[PDB]
What we know:
CATH architecture of the domain at 312-484: Alpha Horseshoe
Distance between the termini: 70 Å
Radius of gyration: 30 Å
Subcellular location: Cytoplasm
InterPro entries: ARM-type_fold, C2_domain_sf, Kinase-like_dom_sf, PI3/4_kinase_cat_dom, PI3/4_kinase_cat_sf, PI3/4_kinase_CS, PI3K-type_C2_dom, PI3K_ABD
Largest sheet: 6 strands, antiparallel
Bound molecules: the ligand Cn1nc(-c2cnc(N)c(-n3nnc4ccccc43)n2)nc1C1(c2ccccc2)CC1
Shape: globular
EC number: 2.7.1.137, 2.7.1.153
CATH class of the domain at 312-484: Mainly Alpha
Number of strands: 26
CATH topology of the domain at 312-484: Serine Threonine Protein Phosphatase 5, Tetratricopeptide repeat
Strand content: 15-25%
Keywords: Adaptive immunity, ATP-binding, Chemotaxis, Cytoplasm, Differentiation, Immunity, Inflammatory response, Innate immunity, Kinase, Lipid metabolism, Nucleotide-binding, Phosphoprotein, Transferase
Structural class: alpha+beta
Amino acid sequence: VKKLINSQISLLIGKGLHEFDSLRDPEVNDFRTKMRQFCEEAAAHRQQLGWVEWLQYSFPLQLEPNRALLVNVKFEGSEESFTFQVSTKDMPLALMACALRKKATVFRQQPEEYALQVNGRHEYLYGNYPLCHFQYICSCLHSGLTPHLTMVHSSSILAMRDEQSNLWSLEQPFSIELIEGRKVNAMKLVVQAGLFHGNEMLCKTVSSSEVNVCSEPVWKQRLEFDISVCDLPRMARLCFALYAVVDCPIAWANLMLFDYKDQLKTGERCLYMWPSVLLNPAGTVRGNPNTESAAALVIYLPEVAPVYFPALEKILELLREILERELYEHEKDLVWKMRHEVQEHFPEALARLLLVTKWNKHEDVAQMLYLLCSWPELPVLSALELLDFSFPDCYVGSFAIKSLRKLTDDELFQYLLQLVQVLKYESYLDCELTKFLLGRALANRKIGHFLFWHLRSEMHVPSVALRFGLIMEAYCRGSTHHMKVLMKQGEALSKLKALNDFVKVSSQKTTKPQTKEMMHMCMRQETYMEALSHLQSPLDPSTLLEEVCVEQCTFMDSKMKPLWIMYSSEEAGSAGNVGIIFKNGDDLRQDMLTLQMIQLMDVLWKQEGLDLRMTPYGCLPTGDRTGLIEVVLHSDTIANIQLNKSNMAATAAFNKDALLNWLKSKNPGEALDRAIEEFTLSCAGYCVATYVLGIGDRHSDNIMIRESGQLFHIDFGHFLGNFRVPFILTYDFVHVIQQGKTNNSEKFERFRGYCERAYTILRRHGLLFLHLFALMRAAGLPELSCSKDIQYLKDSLALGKTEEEALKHFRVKFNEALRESW
Ligand SMILES: Cn1nc(-c2cnc(N)c(-n3nnc4ccccc43)n2)nc1C1(c2ccccc2)CC1
């Protein structure tokens, strides 16, 4: 029984559970035990929940950040439905009450017992909220489509829950014996060694003696550091760098001076080094698992006796305003002097105080930790800044989580990608961040779905494969049913990869209609038909990919031959006519990050009352250079619309009219007025979005138009001006904005106003963009690798200037794009 679950986890995570045992590591074994129990206890509480509370887990509410409408309602065991005339201000309970009264007149004879399931979707309508606050109703309100809902009784929901169950004394300096190496290179070898506490040094780096390349080099040298053993912070990091000199970097390796049990490491240690692109403190504290080819560094941690880092009770036992808006030595001394006044009057300034404290002097740390243990809870924004590698202390790490508990399931979902990357900065497997991540994942099925995929997509990277595999296993222990649900998704993606491999080969050997017909024949096979059907969309668990519409499936002509997979659902009808894009060969992490950042911009705008009709379509990396994209139906690229093909309704005399004529054929008469507003709003939003994010390499092939008039951008191959990029304005768009007139200044000044507003709103939450992009440096992304990358945002947002100076600077950049526009 349990054996099947193990073999299931192994296949799902893509790593055998025997691999964890084979290492014979007690840190791993202790993580597996402690977290399993934690996740099994998390699974237990879930079984003793209420039916509404279970709906809050399985299907969390999709809400938005008067006027009547038609709504179709049916009951679970019947085809017969009723169409009502409800208001957008109505609660689902009133709609549920109408459905029960209309059932009673048909059947010839309480709303609080039911829930409204969205037809052919893992979405529900409940809670004291008006219908126009629900994301599904709003999708139906703007498109004009009729919403279809199903009355699901408390007993049927409770049936689902049931079928889905399971010390200061050591004053000598820190020193090490650098014994020998086992590397490969072309010259002499030097071992540079430093002691770090996050981004900064505890003492100055000490180098080794130049020993000839004759690999398998021997030093047997005693390296001393200008720091006392008693001064070593709990999270102290000993970092090594091996390089060739007559500079050529060869490899790097880091290790924690204390273990997971808080004991100071002593003795002989073999360090399997990682290849180099000089000293890398941010890099992993675990060795290269490629012991076969990886270079090794033999070092000795000298004994000082068993010494454990002191417990919290022992640690606890032992012109100010003008600068508080990078600081000189005298200024640092000021903040440390008036450290008590910071706790009392500037709690949010905790970050600046944590950076001025001398972590290389243990008495200074104890005083800081004493202030931290009695420090007031920080706002979510400040707690996000504290998760950065700049704050490596465990007690600091704990404080950040403590302040992040007030995060809503909506807020946490938005920053989940960033919180997952931060796991790479973690020094030990058992951490307060994982316990928080798992805890929230097991209390919300949507959080858990995306936690899984964010971890599973990185299993091909050896440095994080152990950590992630272990996290994903603990999650599976807490959710046996979800593990199976996730397995179905993996089976589909497995088949998609093989089908794509065929398409890739065939496209080089025959014509497109021939390859297309054989993709279809391959899809129609029993194993393919069964695997590609009846699964929760990995891009959105609430979207159900039911029957695969094989005839409507195809592939794309770009280098990587991306797959176009279409679906259909009877129950959902038109909300079940969903499409996905499978791409293999390109890394989709940046694309996801860019779409998430655009998705947040849209949230920050919608909170301020402004809806710039953005298209935040899904993008999810799933494996090694593998991922998915959400199809935006009834949309086409600018280029395809501009190709002005014959026999069509969009016959344009001039190129500038290509877009407007297309919108005319898709929006007739009084429908076009709406489409032009949709275009103007979305154009304004994407103009500011692309400018702030610094998206380059823009052409008619990567800009798309919805049939509703809504403009959007695809394929974000380059961001932060990494190819300083300017604002972009195209004559064909200005023409649409101006309703198809050479001079329509009033429609353009309104457009210029949408840009300024969007720009001012983003600037107010500028720090939110800085803190998130700073945590994203942990991903490895080459275009977001250093501080110079972060600098583009500081400039594009102008966060060191006043609103009047920044709005003027924006007008200058807007005028430079208008002049460049032909
Ligand atoms: C009708 N159509 N719709 C799309 C579409 C819709 N939603 C998307 N999300 C999307 N995205 N987005 N990112 C992407 C990155 C690579 C490829 C597409 C990407 N593309 N593409 C087409 C065309 C097409 C479609 C099928 C076959 C041949 C040609 C070009 C005309």
